[PDB]
Design a protein around this ligand. Structure first.
Ligand SMILES: NC(=O)c1ccc[n+]([C@@H]2O[C@H](COP(=O)([O-])OP(=O)(O)OC[C@H]3O[C@@H](n4cnc5c(N)ncnc54)[C@H](OP(=O)(O)O)[C@@H]3O)[C@@H](O)[C@H]2O)c1
Ligand SMILES: [Ca+2]
Length: 159
């Protein structure tokens, strides 16, 4: 089973010039927790911006080009990336936009962080049919001294 995890601002904005604008530590803890010990699939731009493998997870990078770092597993097709994960109970797709669009139709769950921030970006999360998804978990939070924006964690499962 494939799951997508992403943080979205107003207008499904997910990124700006290969960077996430805001500073949401509650979000990092959420991501960590949901990704720990699972394989993660990400696109080459996302890889570049992270620069080092995420620890305690098999890191699969999708690129048309030959890989350039032996610390991670390079694949060149969606199907290849799924096959590389083996038979685990859940695969985490972590971005970016081009990647999420592609995994979407195959995904069974979404973990989203809705952030109350207004920012401009060059990338947006894919527009999904809300009728196909059921919201099974949702917890809202007010900004705090650590988190400068309010946010809501949400979990959706395909019907
Ligand atoms: N808000 C969030 O939660 C979140 C999570 C992740 C990322 N992001 C953001 O997303 C932005 C980057 O997204 P992006 O769409 O520009 O890039 P991306 O999806 O990270 O990378 C796309 C690249 O991956 C490779 N690729 C994609 N599909 C492929 C396929 N079927 N076969 C082979 N290679 C494939 C291609 O690389 P080649 O050019 O090498 O073929 C493609 O150029 C950043 O600003 C970042 O901050 C946000
Ligand atoms: Ca059902």
């Amino acid at each position: 089973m494939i799951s997508l995890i992403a943080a979205l601002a107003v207008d499904r904005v997910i990124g700006m010039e290969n960077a996430m604008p805001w500073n949401l530590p509650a979000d990092l803890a959420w991501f960590k927790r949901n990704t720990l010990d699972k394989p993660v699939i990400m696109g080459r731009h996302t890889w570049e911006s992270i620069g080092r493998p995420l620890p305690g997870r098999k890191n699969i990078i999708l690129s048309s080009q030959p890989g350039t770092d032996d610390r991670v597993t390079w694949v060149k097709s969606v199907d290849e990336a799924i096959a590389a994960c083996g038979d685990v109970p859940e695969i985490m797709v972590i971005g970016g936009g081009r990647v999420y669009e592609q995994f979407l139709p195959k995904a069974q769950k979404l973990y989203l962080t809705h952030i109350d921030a207004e920012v401009e970006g060059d990338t947006h999360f894919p527009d999904y049919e809300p009728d196909d998804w059921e919201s099974v978990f949702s917890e809202f939070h007010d900004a705090d001294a650590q988190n400068s924006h309010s946010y809501c964690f949400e979990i959706l499962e395909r019907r």
